[PDB]
Each structure stands twice: as C-alpha cells, then as structure tokens.
Amino acid sequence: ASIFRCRQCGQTISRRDWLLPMGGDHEHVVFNPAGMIFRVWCFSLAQGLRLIGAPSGEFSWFKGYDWTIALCGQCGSHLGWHYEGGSQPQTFFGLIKDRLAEGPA
Amino acid sequence: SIFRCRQCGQTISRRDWLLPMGGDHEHVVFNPAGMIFRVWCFSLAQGLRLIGAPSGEFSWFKGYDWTIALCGQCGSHLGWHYEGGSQPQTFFGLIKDRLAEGPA
Amino acid sequence: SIFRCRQCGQTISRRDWCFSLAQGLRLITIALCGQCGSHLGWHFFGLIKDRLAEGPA
Ligand SMILES: Cc1cc(N)ccc1C(=O)N[C@H]1CCC(=O)NC1=O
Ligand SMILES: Cc1cc(N)ccc1C(=O)N[C@H]1CCC(=O)NC1=O
Ligand SMILES: [Zn+2]
Ligand SMILES: [Zn+2]
Ligand SMILES: [Zn+2]
C-alpha cells in the first residue's frame, strides 16, 4: 500500500500497484526536442491530474501513442503526460519520478 | 530514436543499433562488487572513450573481452566495449539507465 | 555463475544446479523470492528466467 503524491501539494496521484512495465521497464529516461531530460515512471492509471490540450503524436516517446500534458489538478505542477490511442494498453501515464513523493496509503 | 548520455547529452547510439545477443538485447547482470546492471547490447555506438586494455576477467559474455566505455564528453561510465569473440566480433554493452532515449 | 533475484539481489541458485536445488525462496508451490517476494517461479524448481540476474560466484 504505497501511493505517489504530488511533491508540491500532497495530492494523491497514483499507486505503486499501478506501475506498468512499458517495453520491459516501468522506468524510462527520455529527452524531448528541447533537450530536457526526464526520468519517467509509467503507471496504468492515475487520479488528481488535469490533462491539458488535445492529444499530440509529435515526438511521442512511446510508439503508437498520442500524449497530453498532465498537471497536478490541485496545484498545477507539471507531473508528466497521459498517453492514449495505442493497444495493450490503450492508455497509461508517464509521470516524472522526481516530482512525486512515495508514502504509505 | 537516439540514445544520448543522460549526464550531458552526448550522442551515443540508436534504437536501430540494438543487438539481440543470445536472443535478447537486454541482459540483467551483476559484477563482483554486487552492482546490478540492466545492460542493453548494441552493434554500434559513438561518442565514447574506451579506457585501458581489454580483459576477459568476469566477462558476462562468453568468448568476449571487455574494455570500460566512458562518455567521451563527460567521462560518465556508460558501459563496456566487448571484443575478441565471433558473430559478432565486437559489440557494446551499455547501462540502460545511464542513457536517455529521444528524437533523432 | 550465480543466479540472483533481479528485483532485490537475493541469491537463488547456480549454474551447477529448471533447477535441482535453490535457496532463498519461500514456497507458498508458487516460489516467491524470500527477500522481496517477487514471483520467481514454482517448485524441480521452475524459475522465470526474465526474473533473474546472473553474475560471478
Ligand atoms: C515536444 C516538445 C516541444 C517543446 N518546445 C517543449 C517540450 C516538448 C515535450 O516535452 N514534448 C514531449 C511530450 C511527451 C512525449 O512523449 N515526448 C516529448 O518529447
Ligand atoms: C571486474 C570488476 C571488478 C571490480 N572490483 C568492480 C567492478 C568490476 C566490473 O564491473 N566488471 C564488469 C566488467 C564487464 C563484464 O562483462 N563483467 C563485469 O563484471
Ligand atoms: Zn499538486
Ligand atoms: Zn556524458
Ligand atoms: Zn527479490
């Protein structure tokens, strides 16, 4: 019973039970076109976020998925991205590990 | 999909250059210091600096000698170059979490 | 060459021992890693190879 909370405001976001091994690992170190590097943990589900914009396929780290920016729905901190439009799974979250705090349910 | 050094962005390898050694490009191995590594095998890499002389001692890959591979830019230890074997003669075993994957 | 739990590094088995002997498991048989409780296989010990790591003795 471990949960991940927004490090800025404490809202519960996801659960350790929901870690998802995308391509063999739940941890992906990635860089965007601006050269910013993120350590992303993949989760099946989340709550308490606000997904902003329409999904985009441009520069997706995960082939066959479109992404949307995920903010903490409470404080607006950028916590990662939601991925959709794929298969097995259809949808999942890539959340920035350093912006989360893990603790007891 | 390009692999860069996670510490500095040096260009290192490509997803196209992954090599399934023994049926898998990923090997999970431990050294005699008890460190566990998820090693990805690549046919080719660039931007590294190979340090020292090859050694067969404790090689995870039978028939190959290894040389330490640093990031040629920042000096971070990214893995090993393997040589002296067959099919292939040489390849790179890089530590997955010391790389960052992203756009070409 | 020694087989260890990939998740926590518990020693499980070796090259010399589908295994005939293992250590460090808890049989529930479903074989859990005794240390971290990862499902590593069943008891003949059958172990998920992808759930192991290999190194020197
Ligand atoms: C595409 C992009 C352009 C910018 N000017 C700044 C940032 C980004 C960015 O992080 N995009 C991310 C979105 C999620 C993903 O999968 N891949 C990406 O590169
Ligand atoms: C051989 C060795 C001795 C130490 N004192 C510390 C670390 C290491 C080490 O990582 N060696 C690696 C080199 C690459 C290989 O294939 N197998 C290994 O165990
Ligand atoms: Zn928040
Ligand atoms: Zn570097
Ligand atoms: Zn374990």
Residue numbers in the entry:
A (entry chain B): 19 to 123
B (entry chain A): 20 to 123
C (entry chain C): 20 to 36, 60 to 70, 86 to 100, 110 to 123
What did the original publication write about this model?
Nowadays, the E3 ligase substrate receptor cereblon (CRBN), thalidomide’s primary target, is of particular importance in the fields of MGs and PROTACs. However, these CRBN ligands induce the degradation of IMiD neosubstrates and are inherently unstable, degrading hydrolytically under moderate conditions.
Halo derivatives 8d (R = F) and 11a (R = Cl) could benefit from both mechanisms, haloalkyl compound 11b (R = CF3) displays strong deactivating properties, whereas compounds 11c (R = CH3), 11d (R = OMe), and 11e (R = OH) have ascending electron donating features. The inherent conformational flexibility of benzamides 11 along the amide bond was investigated using a force field-based method implemented in Schrödinger MacroModel. As expected, IMHBs were observed in low-energy conformers, except for 11a–11c. Fortunately, we could study all compounds generated in this iterative step through cocrystal structures in complex with the hTBD homolog MsCI4.44 These data confirmed that the preferred orientation of the ortho substituent toward the amide NH was preserved in the bound state of all ligands except for 11b. Sub van der Waals distances ranging from 1.3 to 2.0 Å were seen in 8d, 11a, 11c, 11d, 11e, and 11f.
